[model samples]
Target: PITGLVYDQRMMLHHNMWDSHHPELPQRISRIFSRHEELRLLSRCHRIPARLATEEELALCHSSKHISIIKSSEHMKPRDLNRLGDEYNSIFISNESYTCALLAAGSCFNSAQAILTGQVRNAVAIVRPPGHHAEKDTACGFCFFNTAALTARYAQSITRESLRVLIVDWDVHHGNGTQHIFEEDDSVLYISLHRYEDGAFFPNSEDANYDKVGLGKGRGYNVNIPWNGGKMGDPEYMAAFHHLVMPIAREFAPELVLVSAGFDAARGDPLGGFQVTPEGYAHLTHQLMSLAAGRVLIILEGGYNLTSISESMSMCTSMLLGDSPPSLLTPLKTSATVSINNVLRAHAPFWSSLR
Candidate 1:
């Protein structure tokens, strides 16, 4: 069975929304605890102690300038904090947030370390304050650090002789920050399939188009499969992966696979309107685990809705343990429409080269 790690301390609840009318810190904790209780009832997975990501581990992906900025701005003025926008609405530089962020990052690193040391074949780090929108020099998207990216970077560094790393981010929102960090590095292949509300979304960047693969040597290495706002059920997601992601990943043959596993894409998430049911998440997890000798590390990124988060998390754990997922609340049928034709056209070179 795959091992799992969760950092569910009350201290993680410190990053509360600044909006006075919104849920208070205690309420947020209650919500998270409710999900935790649900998970405990659903899956009897063991919890591992939270660990802190060392400075060396963080440096694997984050720039020193960015790290210093986060470290020094722990007690910033209101204006400095406000500059962060809604990303900081639920964020504060209290000892709890800082310490828990470290723990979350550490949990991810430890999961990767376990895979490398043969302690576990697969693992998931259930952490808070999702990290994927955090870039090389900025902390946005409610992320103080990019834990998944850091884990991939650490794995690469430890196996410096074999530097290939693949990051597949299936979050509802684009991982622009993570893409930016590895865009110029050919050793790391980052692929993201996210719902793009044009440039109206957070971390608004114009470079999220499907054509913006990467630059120079990293041009063909990066892949961005943007999804339009709609009911993106399991079939469309599986089709997209089969037609776009799998073909590319098979060619890359990465030594380590890191997933920014955000459950927000699950059905009923307020932030995400798509309908990726828990069964879909389980299938996705199973597919990724099949690659890279089961050397996969799942780091939580986003999933606000309580019910969907718990259900999707349970599905993921079931997949990791090689157990059949619970009766799927929503079963997906294969789509008859060839919706992936456009993706195939855009990525013709990538797909054709494999043959």
Candidate 2:
């Protein structure tokens, strides 16, 4: 069985990232416990208490200037926070958002620390105000502090200080911030499978495109699989993993694997049009676990629909606990398959796995 769970209630307290009909809500995790309880998934793993990460730990991956900005957010009203959000794109914070973000980051640290300390072999840090979009200086896409990135950094700093980490981001949106944060460092391998739609998508940027692999020694260390449409599904993803993601990750030979697990790709998500079923997530988790010898840390990144988030997470966590993976619900489509090929062709020179 997989080690256990790590999360915090503070993660859900920060709210109002939307003008109305907000997709990211506290109900996301709330529904998880209920559904997991009905499925007996809650009783399966150990729930680890998450503590606040100090300013020093925050500095491990962030700039002091940006850190102070979030520090001051706790005193802002919703109107003031909305004004702050206006200064950027999707970033939102409440009076409690700062503490919540710290706790969210802390939950990630606790999960990784638990694994390094031998308390658990693997765990999921399911916190909201998700990271992977927060860079060194800016926070966007409702993300702050890049929780998965810092998890890798903290793991290295506290564990072996030389540990190699692999980050697999399956969020529908490319982890632009996460990619840039470690773009020049080969110590952490960043691989993302997202909806790029040729830079015509939300969280759009030139960096998320295939041409930007990595700079200097980090070349080939950063991989991006950009899907062409909202209809990409499990088969397309499986083909990409089979062709690119797994092979390169294997050669990277990381001691720990951190997944920027976003379930928005699952069906019924208001913001996510891609179709990845709960079963699909479970299968993906299972296959990826086979790589790192089952040492995986899944940090929740994005999944707006409550039902989709809860079910997808349950299936994934179940797979981590050694349960049988669900079958692929959608057959492979020619469109998705073709897109996977284009990505392979683009990154061919960068990664030996393609050639």
Candidate 3:
């Protein structure tokens, strides 16, 4: 009755043999898996091996041109890895980067497939080289192809029901790429909660503004909750979930809920400065369990601090294990309360369930 977990060690073999000045590391996935192993939580769920995502599968959300760009990296000289990195800010690669990216994306598909087939109640893709940041035509922000988008597409293609997907991005940074890909697709709801300091954050863009909502047919489907600054901890997040996230989710009545599970928002991540603890994340995951008949998928995204990533991910894995998450006694942020109210008001016109 716990969650399903999918992963493979080849993810760390991204051929990242050289040292990088950037923060995204090869050990990102390894450390979390090892931590999960240490906590003896590894056996709590069904285990599935991560596999390769095919070219056709990648094409679901990426352009052949973009796929070719990443595929071409395999032939680049070791020195030119930086060129590929330059194409996408803060990315690093190796001779195996293309294959490694496949495994990362494929691992997510495996996890999602388990859920779709009713093999597992819900699942977690602990694989990485995170995908929410990858756009349709470009790879940026440490991502190559949009994994969640591709998985959602794959799920829709195979499902007997008309599947609707709600992608909740709680990463500290906005999932600009995910939003861009699904902005006009009414079938998918792309909601991102991120730290935005007037475009001061990485992947800075005015498009992350709360009012951007959605375009044309997808109006009100894309929800952006811009945490104006750091230090918006448990209270702020919970308030947003209750007022903004949950209400619309209930209205949408999605067949599946996918969380862009980024722990960088955890208390002390180097890239994300905030105060959401592991317990806070556990409760956050618990709050999301109410949707889609308890079908939720958590995919790894961003989290730099090893301790934070391990603890936070372990907490999420525990949620799938059906463990009771710890309770928080913190007061809700006043600004967050007001912000949620405003967001609900903005969305009220579109969502009949919003009061």
Candidate 4:
């Protein structure tokens, strides 16, 4: 059975620092909580206890300077904090924000430690104030610190060996910061499948291109399969993995697998236009588990639509529990415009050669 964690503390981090009202900041999180509540009431699976992360634990992945800045900013005026960065718009100065991030980060650590120590075969950290976008020195994308990265780092520390950690990000936006953190390090393999509009998005770069790969010993370690609008679906994602991720993973043979679980790729998510169904996500989760002896730690990243998010979570939890989630067999009505050929053509040179 898979252990899980959930909480309502994420609401405290919502703010209009960007001066733009992106409904996703609050609406998406509300969906995450509602789903957890439903699952709790239904007595779905084992509920792992929720706990706050400590400043010292956070320091494992975040720099003392960054931590100190956020700590001191807690008492500063809103205007002062806003000047620190635009991402601070979603970050508010309050004991709750600090406490919640600590708890959320700590909760992720707890899940990773559990898996590393053999306490659980698999675990999920249903945490918020998502961490993929936060880098070593800066925070962005409603993220403060790289929670998944921290957990992976913790796994290496505990095992006391050279560890290869595979981080798969399926969020609508690229995990630019996480990639930057581990781009040159062979110990971490960062694979991201996100929307690439020819450098039209934030942190615009060519890192997501398959040809970009990694530098030095890290070459071929960073795999990016950028999906254009109208081209993402079950077949597309599955093909990317079967043709790209799996073979590479088998070659690298990571000691642990860390998933930057984001649901924004769901069909109705406002932040994304992809058509990945819940069943598709469940299948992906199952396949990833099969690769690493089911030792997987999933940390929450993004998902907006309440119904889709809840349903996806249900499907994933079912798979984690070793149950064959019937939803995985459900078929999605394919769009005629959805071009699998285009995807194959775009990624063939980078992934197909592996075969």
Candidate 5:
């Protein structure tokens, strides 16, 4: 099996930011693929063609009304598009946003199938209109569709056995939508590490807190490592991973691992003030590879800085290609012990690994 890469130029069609300085530009994907080409990363991976997600596929996570609202964008004028875009938080819509959104979601769905069917060992979908922020009924935070959530549902649906999924969201911002979608389902464990800053970040909500464990049977399955505002460099992130994320993840032992790979956490991102280096991303990818028999599916979520995202994505892609992660000569220094302790106390009752 080979590592699969999924991307399409048509996804670049959804740039409708009125400000011209919107962070989620189409260049995000183009620049990432460009860097991969420069590093010869794409040549080593099998190319997976992108396609539009079917209505049923979109419905896995989005409501019919939500789908209808997105579909309506195709006929709206620029003025109408701006009005609709303004209806959502930090969102912009163009005539082709509907098409592009579906393509992005479909690309992730296909990537999941490729992993499940053994056509690929693992895959990375360089999609746009970044998901993780979109909800069942509305779009938010530059996302109109919840790609990873839908893909997880689709993956479980196709398999005869109940497929256990572990979704690790490493975006600087919380994957509020993804968490909400799977919050009540134990089959999919959703873990998000994001800048909470006492609920002041974008998509500001108390739900991103560490104590917002899953609901009902999903209790303890949801993990949120909320970071206090500061320079959350690689050390803090790796500390949380080692002390909190990996232990529970190994205990859960998922059949599929989905990473909401948002490079905004990398240093130099305009929106995210963290200092996670590209080598940090490579090591993170390497850590996830140890799980799910290396059946990891990395879906693009959020990242604004072109240079930061491009380089970080290439580093992750290189790791997926079985390259040894570049050494981070710095000694392993862990921080965030406060957040880690709070999370362990909240989840200790349910997870034996935490107890």
Candidate 6:
């Protein structure tokens, strides 16, 4: 099966209509698509068509009231839209926002369908109104809909047998919404590596800590490698995979893998403040491809800094298209090993591989 690519010009319509300088601009996807084109990555993959996700589909991970709120914004005037946007944290709304948001979610859903039906081995959905921050009840952090969470639910619903899903979020900010959506569910194992700074980050929640583990029957299914500060580059991330992420993930043995691929962690990102390079992202993509028989769906989440996001995305796409990941010659950083140790101490009891 060929790798799948999901994109639509329509998704570029959901920009902050008020602020042209908004970090989460429409150029985020446009630049990425351009990078994929320049790198000649799109031609080798299967193109998945985009559609407007139905309210029922959105309800997979959203509340009816939340869906209604988004639906009602379709006809609001600029002032009304601004007022409505102010109600939600880090959000903006235009008439096209609804349609564009639906397209983003639907594009990801279509990618999931294609992956499961074997039409595509794995997929990449380059979408906006980036999810992972949006919640079941509220929109937050420039995301109006939770794309990966909805895809996970959709993938499970379409299959008869229990489908174990693994969501690996390498975004610079914790995927608080995705974690919350599956926090009490054991089927989807959620792992996130983000700049924490002891709850001083964007979401600014203590739950982003390394020892959060999980709740209820979902206990030990959630893993958070909270980076204490910025400037954590390839060595830190590679050490994390070698010590913590890969070990526990291999034991879980998921049937499908979803990456909340946010490039803000890449070097040169203005908001992320980290130093992971595009080459590092390629290596991370390579590591994930080794799992689930290479069934990995990388859905765009967040990333500013057009150059960084575009280059980083292209590298990951290249890796998905069967290119070799560049070797990482840098030795492991001491802080990375120490951080991995903290994660191991928290999770060793749940995963024998960690022990």
Q: lDDT of each structure? A: 0.71, 0.83, 0.85, 0.69, 0.90, 0.89
Ten residues in a row with the worst lDDT in model 3?
Answer: 14-23
| lDDT per residue (tens digit) for residues 77-118 in model 1 | 656655544344234444355556677788877778777877
Tens-digit lDDT string for candidate 5 (282-347):
999999999999999999989888999999988998999999889872433344667778898999
For candidate 2, write residues 230-338 as lDDT tens digits.
5877777777888888888888888999999999999888786888788888888998888666789988889988888899998888988888876563466766776
List, residue by residue over 186-206, the lDDT tens digit for candidate 3: 899988888887788877898
Best by lDDT: 5
In model 1, the clashing pairs are none
Which stretches of model 4 miss by more than 4 angstroms?
Answer: 6-21, 24-30, 36-44, 87-95, 229-231, 327-353
Query: Which ten contiguous residues of candidate 1 have the minimum total lDDT?
Result: 329-338
For each candidate in turn, the TM-score is 0.86, 0.95, 0.96, 0.84, 0.97, 0.97
Q: Is candidate 1 or candidate 6 better by lDDT?
A: 6
By lDDT, the candidates rank as 5, 6, 3, 2, 1, 4
Which prediction has more favorable TM-score, 3 or 5?
Answer: 5
Kindly give the stretch of ten consecutive residues in candidate 6 with the minimal lDDT sum.
328-337
Candidate 3 residues lying further than 4 Å off, grouped into runs, are: 15-18, 160-162
Q: Could you give candidate 6's per-residue lDDT for residues 1-355 as a string of tens digits?
A: 5899998987888767767898988889999999999989989989999988899999999999999999999999899999999998778888898888899889988998998888988889999878899899999988888989998998998984369899999999999999999998889999999888888888999989889999998899999998874478888888888888898889999989999999999888999998999999999999999999999999999999999999998899888888888866577566666677889999998999987
Model 2, position 101, has a per-residue lDDT of 83
RMSD of 1: 3.7
Q: What C-alpha lDDT does candidate 6 achieve relative to the native structure?
A: 0.89
- Summing lDDT over every window of 10 consecutive residues in candidate 5, give the lowest-scoring window: 329-338
